[PDB]
Structure 1
Amino acid sequence: PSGEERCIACKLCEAICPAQAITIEAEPRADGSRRTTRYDIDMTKCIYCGFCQEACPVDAIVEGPNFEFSTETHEELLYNKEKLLNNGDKWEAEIAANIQADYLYR
């Protein structure tokens, strides 16, 4: 809620990703903080399994509701940190509610 980036580059969303879709490359931020310099997802390798969001210890990466993001180019479906953060800043009003509804089960 403070706007602070929630990922910390613990690098297990890619440990468990059974498609090897996720890459991370991490550094200190010059504030003195464990944060990423890279978060890519080849969404042409993702199988939409949810393991990354049930492995993240901080609820940083999620798998949201949008199923209407078809494209006319392969290169558009290869995401990076900025696209994922755009998605988050777009879909927070939905994802927060979905999480509020589904927790106490997970």
Structure 2
Amino acid sequence: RFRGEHALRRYPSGEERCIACKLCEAVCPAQAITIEAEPRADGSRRTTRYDIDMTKCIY
């Protein structure tokens, strides 16, 4: 259960799991997540910018 450095995971097929739903951005107490998204070349709902400020995050 230890929480340390952040990471973005992938599906076993290699596709990114994130669907640009911004729930993490909405729920972040420190407002350390910045998300900007647009449809991908194949029409998938995927992120273009996903930033985390580790000097602002409270882990």
TM-score (norm 2): 0.79
More strand by share: 2
Deviation at 1:21, TM superposition (A): 0.1
* Counterpart secondary structure, 2:38: strand
Q: Which residue of 2 aligns with 1:3?
A: 14
More helix by share: 1
**Structure 1 segments of 4 or more deviating over 2 A?**
none
Read off the aligned partner of 1:42 and give its amino acid letter: D
Q: Which residue of 1 aligns with 2:34?
A: 23
- CA displacement, residues 18-70 of structure 1 (integer Å, 9 cap, x when unaligned): 0000000000011110000010000001111xxxxxxxxxxxxxxxxxxxxxx
CA root-mean-square deviation: 0.5
**Does structure 1 residue 38 correspond to structure 2 residue 35?**
no
> Alignment length, in residue pairs?
48
Gaps of 5+ in 2: 1-11
Higher-RCO chain (CA-CA 8 Å, sequence separation at least 6): 2
Deviation at 1:12, TM superposition (A): 1.1
TM-score (norm 1): 0.45
